[PDB]
Amino acid sequence: SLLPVPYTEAASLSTGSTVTIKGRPLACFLNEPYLQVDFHTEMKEESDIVFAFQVCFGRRVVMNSREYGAWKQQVESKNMPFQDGQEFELSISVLPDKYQVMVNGQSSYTFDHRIKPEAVKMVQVWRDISLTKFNVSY
Amino acid sequence: SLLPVPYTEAASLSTGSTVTIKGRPLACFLNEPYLQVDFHTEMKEESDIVFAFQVCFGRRVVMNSREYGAWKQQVESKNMPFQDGQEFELSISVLPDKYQVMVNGQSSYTFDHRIKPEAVKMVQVWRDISLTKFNVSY
């Protein structure tokens, strides 16, 4: 809808930064749409990813990093606070030791920093969603 | 680009029908964009799927059916004729006993009919691609 998808925005992050996203899946959960949010070290899409957050709606979440072009140790969660057919509000906050992922106001996932968040230069939001809000607290 | 994505078109299929698609992934293969083509029994996206063809570009292809709302036995192929960053031409032909998937003019995947192709009423093409051509031979 309102924002282009894939959505790419330059960004700087440190402890206390929050990335807030509002959007809606493009398909019912039965069709397993995805959402992905990638925290990149450079503006190019092929650059390393300090934190990749990938939702398969109704099924699972996987998180990982891509370092020197290589995907690293995948982490999986079956927590699924997202609601079929509904708009969601997603908040990713930078804590001292990890990212905190809030969904609709509830803590839902965490991911320990593998690389300092100060390495981030770009955030990309893509896959099977419409996007109405993207904000980085500065 | 030219066609909306997700792209949904009513369709009737029988032996000798061909569905031809031209498109391009929205991201480099390192980012694992998807392409999916679903042959549905009704116009609604939640209806059963006689043949679901899902490409994870650079990684794998999985194929399945969704019958009475339940995904069935998944089939996987690591054949990857798609080229990183390039437009592709995909042809799905209905043979008497199976679907034949051509990629850029080469036979690449097959999938035996689990349900008669005459059950199809709709084709949907979606996930991380731009779409410039969609044609059903009639």
Swiss-Prot record, chains A, B:
Expressed abundantly in the bone marrow. Expressed exclusively by eosinophils and basophils. Not detected in monocytes and neutrophils. Expressed in CD25-positive regulatory T-cells (Treg) (at protein level). Found in intestinal tissue from patients with Celiac disease, expression is directly related to the histological grade of mucosal damage and to the number of eosinophils found in the duodenal lesion (at protein level). Found in sputum of patients with eosinophilic inflammatory diseases such as asthma (at protein level). One of its GO terms (biological process) is T cell apoptotic process. Transmembrane segments: none annotated. CDD domains: GLECT. The keyword Cytoplasm applies. The modification N-acetylserine is found at S1. The record marks N135 as: Not glycosylated. Pfam families: Gal-bind_lectin. GO terms for molecular function: carbohydrate binding; identical protein binding. It is found in: Cytoplasm, Cytosol; Cytoplasmic granule. Regulates immune responses through the recognition of cell-surface glycans. Essential for the anergy and suppressive function of CD25-positive regulatory T-cells (Treg). Forms hexagonal bipyramidal crystals, known as Charcot-Leyden crystals, in tissues and secretions from sites of eosinophil-associated inflammation and some myeloid leukemias. This is Galectin-10.
